[PDB]
């Protein structure tokens, strides 16, 4: 199962390395190491002034042959597998490369692999509010000056939300507050940072929660008031009492012993306002259960039973019309969990027998096919072991090159490439499509066998490229009645958005039917020349699996894509609802009403407060949207721009109500924070069926879903099982029936006198 990120003794102690780019002249030797928490990769250079790389911003680590090399500087032989490249950035396009050639040999490998595990660790990305604060603290302790001191101006910059109050907070702890002075690591402990935060960041919002329930005799809280709170206010009402037993007295004690600092309250089994503040942002009071973020989904259902993270013209970094095509976008897409990349291939030059990749008749730079194939075999299963689809849009007018095109596929992917069908799933009608489990570490080829754009005119299908196509054989779509009569799960068809839209409004149930056995791929229209994106939720709602997007444009479409594909271990495969999988069953995606055998939910979301949301003093407003079926969708709610600050804003506004969610198992809540003007602070994508109830911190994310550190929101939620407006009486009678039958037996007993 999942593990906290352990940092090996080697990365703790440190190893010597040479830092370099293409301009560096002299050999710059540095000692690389990772703090014990696995937050930052830090090296101290010549100046003795430190440089830090946030390990959560890392996108890939390369070594051996997949690592970057230079030329000019130079170092004879080549088997120097001590080259390590670190790739980080806030989205697939804006990648930054750091090179660290090791001094000792058997180290670069160990580092490259260890850094990778820390960077892609799930608990690290979904850590407690307390941990992201302890992370901020770690940065202040590493980014020391040339004299191993913590510059006060670094504490004023980290909290530039209010520099005047910061001075008062530091002074209150007996720390330097002047912009010219420094603080010695020895006198700047986690204790004194937590004290610093508590005096800077007044929390009238937490006061209001201690008063809620209960202790009006207020300085502290009792073990019972806390156990009753965790069990009643903070527990998910949808969960079974046997499967998820409530906390006992013995377990509520461990919480006071774990969080209560005042060694005198701990004695009298009581918790303080400081000890409750620690719990609110601890690792038991997360917004989501670990089961949601984990690889817990059934991976044995047919390939058609899953939504699959997909990309459109993956090779593009900017717009469709003109622009540059990359080899690096494939690496970034695949590493991000994408399970379906697109190779719009053209034909090679006469002397240069090598086919290239680009868009079409647009003066758009091209990259060699061979260079894209290798980049895929390299990254395809680094962040996921589940199958990868290669969407081929063939324009090769050559028997030789198309053959040499098949030759590369067998050569570069080797045993991974699925060349023949499985013993259990023959390409016969009636047979279902294989499990993602059945195709672990496999490359399936999607090409012809024997404003739509360049997808309206592909070349003929030769035998070389036809002998690799098996389970994802694309074919001219006729109707749903046809694909049904035919009954072939290995026959799939693509649909340009506008084409997909017509089938969505005209035959939605017939479209869901189809998606239970066959795969359907949706791709944006040729008009979106600015690589704009369509809302994938339209097509997921009709069971569309391969709903491709422009990974180079982080608009709300991709933000929602990254959001939902973080879940199920980032596997890149999400299992469709039961009533969108079973042959037995069918419902109308346009249903304005609940559906028999499906449990609808009600969601109440109240924005209570935010902490360190901007570096500059400005008003903040938070949006609360819901994506799912058309009836379950609301892109409306918005709080009023905060008081006037960005430090500890409190909001007193009724909760945003989603009283009826027909298909909660397909709905995703979106919480996005903004500055007065529209400047995006951060957001979060939460599954409605997993989101917990009560007061929980929502640790915010950037457009790419990378975890921000200081920005966060304290929200109150009530995710409950839906009860129609009138059936509230019959509902309560089924839940505690004894009370109900106790009164009717009482009244009857009280009427025995008058027969």
């Amino acid at each position: 199962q999942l593990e906290p990120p352990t940092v090996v003794e080697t990365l703790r102690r440190g190893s010597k390395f040479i830092k370099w780019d293409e301009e560096t002249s002299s050999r710059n030797l540095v000692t690389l190491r990772v703090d014990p928490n696995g937050f930052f990769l830090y090296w101290t250079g010549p100046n003795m002034e430190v440089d830090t790389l946030d390990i959560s911003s890392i996108r890939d680590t390369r070594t051996g042959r997949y690592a970057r090399l230079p030329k000019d500087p130079k170092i004879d032989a080549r088997l120097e597998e001590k080259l390590m490249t670190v790739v980080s950035g806030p989205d697939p396009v804006n990648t930054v490369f750091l090179n660290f050639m090791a001094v000792q040999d058997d180290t670069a490998k160990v580092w490259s692999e260890e850094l990778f595990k820390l960077a892609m660790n799930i608990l690290a990305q979904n850590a407690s509010r307390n941990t992201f604060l302890r992370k901020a603290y770690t940065k202040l302790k590493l980014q020391v000056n040339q004299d191993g001191r913590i510059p006060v101006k670094n504490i004023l910059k980290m909290f530039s939300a209010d520099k005047k109050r910061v001075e008062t907070a530091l002074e209150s702890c007996g720390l330097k507050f002047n912009r010219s002075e420094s603080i010695r690591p020895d006198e700047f402990s986690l204790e004194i940072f937590e004290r610093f935060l508590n005096k800077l960041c007044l929390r009238p919002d937490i006061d209001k929660i201690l008063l809620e329930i209960g202790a009006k005799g207020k300085p502290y809280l009792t073990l019972e008031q806390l156990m009753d709170f965790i069990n009643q206010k903070q527990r998910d009402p949808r969960l079974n009492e046997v499967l998820y037993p409530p906390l006992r007295p013995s377990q509520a004690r461990l919480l006071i012993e774990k969080y209560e600092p005042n060694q005198q309250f701990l004695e009298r089994d009581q918790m303080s306002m400081e000890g409750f503040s620690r719990y609110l942002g601890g690792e038991e009071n997360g917004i989501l259960p670990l089961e949601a973020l984990d690889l817990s989904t059934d991976m044995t259902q047919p390939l058609s039973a899953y939504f699959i993270n997909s990309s459109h013209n993956t090779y593009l970094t900017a717009g469709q019309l003109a622009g540059t095509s990359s080899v690096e976008m494939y690496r970034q897409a695949l590493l991000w969990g994408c399970r379906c990349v697109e190779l719009d291939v053209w034909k090679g030059r006469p002397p240069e027998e090598e086919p290239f990749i680009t868009h079409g008749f647009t003066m758009t730079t091209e990259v060699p096919l061979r260079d894209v194939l290798e980049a895929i075999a390299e990254t395809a299963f680094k962040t996921s072991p589940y199958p990868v689809i290669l969407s081929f849009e063939n324009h090769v007018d050559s028997a030789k090159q198309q053959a040499k095109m098949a030759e590369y596929c067998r050569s570069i992917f080797g045993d991974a490439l699925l060349i023949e069908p499985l013993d259990k799933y023959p390409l016969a009608p009636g047979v279902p499509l294989p499990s993602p489990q059945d195709l672990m570490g496999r490359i399936l080829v999607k090409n012809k066998k024997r404003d739509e754009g360049t997808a309206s005119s592909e070349v003929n299908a030769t035998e070389e490229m036809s002998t690799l196509v098996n389970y994802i054989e694309p074919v001219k779509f006729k109707s749903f009645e046809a694909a049904r009569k035919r009954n072939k799960c290995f026959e799939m068809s693509s649909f340009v958005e506008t084409k997909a839209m017509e089938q969505l409004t005209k035959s939605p149930m017939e479209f869901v039917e189809y998606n239970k056995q066959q795969l359907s791929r949706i791709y944006p229209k040729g008009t979106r020349v600015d690589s704009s994106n369509y809302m994938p939720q339209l097509f997921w709602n009709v069971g569309c699996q391969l709903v491709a997007l422009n990974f180079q444009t982080l608009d709300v479409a991709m933000q929602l894509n990254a959001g939902v594909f973080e879940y199920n271990g980032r596997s890149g495969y999400l299992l469709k609802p039961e009533f969108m999988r079973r042959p037995d069953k069918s419902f109308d995606p346009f249903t304005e009403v609940i559906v028999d055998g499906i449990v609808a939910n009600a969601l109440r979301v109240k924005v209570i407060s935010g902490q360190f949301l901007s570096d500059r003093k400005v008003g903040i407003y938070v949006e609360v949207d819901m994506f799912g079926l058309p009836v379950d969708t609301r892109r409306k709610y918005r709080t009023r721009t905060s008081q006037g600050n960005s430090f500890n804003p409190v909001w007193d506004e009724e909760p945003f109500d989603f009283p009826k969610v027909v298909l909660p198992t397909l709905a995703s809540l979106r919480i996005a924070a903004f500055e007065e003007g529209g400047k995006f602070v951060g957001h979060r994508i939460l599954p409605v069926s997993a989101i917990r109830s009560g007061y929980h911190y929502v640790c915010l994310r950037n457009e790419a879903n990378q975890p921000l550190c200081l920005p966060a929101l304290l929200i109150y939620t009530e995710a409950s099982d839906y009860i129609p407006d009138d059936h509230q009486d019959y509902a309560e009678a089924l839940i505690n029936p004894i009370k109900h039958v106790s009164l009717m037996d009482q009244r009857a007993r009280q009427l025995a006198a008058l027969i």
Partner: protein, 317 residues
């Protein structure tokens, strides 16, 4: 084909999901060697869950371990995270074999009425050798006994040629009953299970409230709902095997004082519990077709359901 929709309603731990397995054995695709292999892990987990509950019982009830070497085996087992148990090997096997042989743990098993312990405990613990064997394959009786809490609403269709019954299994715990309303549309019959053995037990939801008092109130309530005014009601008084044993030492008059029948009598106890459910219901509308069942006994369910099949059909066409 003619498709009719039945509901399996019950308090919780009554045998709804077990009834479903007998349908899969009798009218379904039964259980193959591979299917059975899918339960080994669950049979290993149930043994751990059960020995952990009895290990808490030793403290709660302050019962001493007759033998000192069992204190160590008790600490080895109590530390296991059942949710990760994928195998059953030494030291755990020899430690559970030894705990089960400890007169102290046996004295505690006898007082199971005083805490929560599954019914298939003794069935499994008395067959550890067969379960520990590294060549172990769960028998069909072994599948019918496993405990796997049901949550949500699961539709299981079964083709009885003449008709196709869409049986709906649900969760029995109180929290599960808030969901029930989402499977109440177009119901033909509701088959209600009550545990005959739970007359001297308390809820897992609430340990000061009597289980049979709960199922009794839930039944008397549910048959007066408007979704069911045109739907037949079959009442299965299940666990008749556990009542036969328990009735010998746990007197019904001590939990239900309006019982003036003789003690140590399985049938008099049986017919008293039936009266409470069906009789003097100010809302005595529907006829209630009752049946005494042992849901883990395939030949019993085969006979009983054959009758419930006839009843449902008739009362329709």
């Amino acid at each position: 084909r003619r498709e009719l929709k039945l509901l399996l309603l019950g308090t919780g731990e009554s045998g709804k999901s077990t009834f479903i397995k007998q349908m899969r054995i009798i009218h379904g695709s039964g259980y193959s060697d591979e299917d059975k292999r899918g339960f080994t892990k669950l049979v290993y987990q149930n043994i751990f869950t059960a020995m952990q509950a009895m290990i808490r019982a030793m403290d709660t009830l302050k019962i001493p371990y007759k033998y000192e070497h069992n204190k160590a085996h008790a600490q080895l087992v109590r530390e296991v995270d059942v949710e990760k148990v994928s195998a059953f090997e030494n030291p755990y096997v020899d430690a559970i074999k030894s705990l089960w042989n400890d007169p102290g743990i046996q004295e505690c098993y006898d007082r199971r009425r005083e805490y929560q312990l599954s019914d298939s405990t003794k069935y499994y613990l008395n067959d550890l050798d067969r379960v520990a064997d590294p060549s172990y394959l769960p028998t069909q009786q072994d599948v019918l006994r496993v405990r796997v809490p049901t949550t949500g609403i699961i539709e299981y269709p079964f083709d009885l040629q003449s008709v196709i019954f869409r049986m709906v299994d649900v969760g029995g715990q109180r929290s599960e009953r808030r969901k029930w309303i989402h499977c109440f549309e177009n119901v033909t019959s509701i088959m209600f299970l009550v545990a005959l053995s739970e007359y001297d037990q308390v809820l897992v939801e609430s340990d000061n409230e009597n289980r049979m008092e709960e199922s009794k109130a839930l039944f008397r309530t549910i048959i007066t709902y408007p979704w069911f005014q045109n739907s037949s009601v079959i009442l299965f008084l299940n666990k008749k095997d556990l009542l036969e044993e328990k009735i010998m030492y746990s007197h019904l008059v001590d939990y239900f004082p309006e019982y003036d029948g003789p003690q140590r009598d399985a049938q008099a106890a049986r017919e008293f519990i039936l009266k409470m459910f069906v009789d003097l219901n100010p809302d005595s509308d529907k006829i209630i077709y009752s049946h005494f069942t042992c849901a883990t006994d395939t030949e019993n369910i085969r006979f009983v359901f054959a009758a419930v099949k006839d009843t449902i059909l008739q009362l329709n066409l």
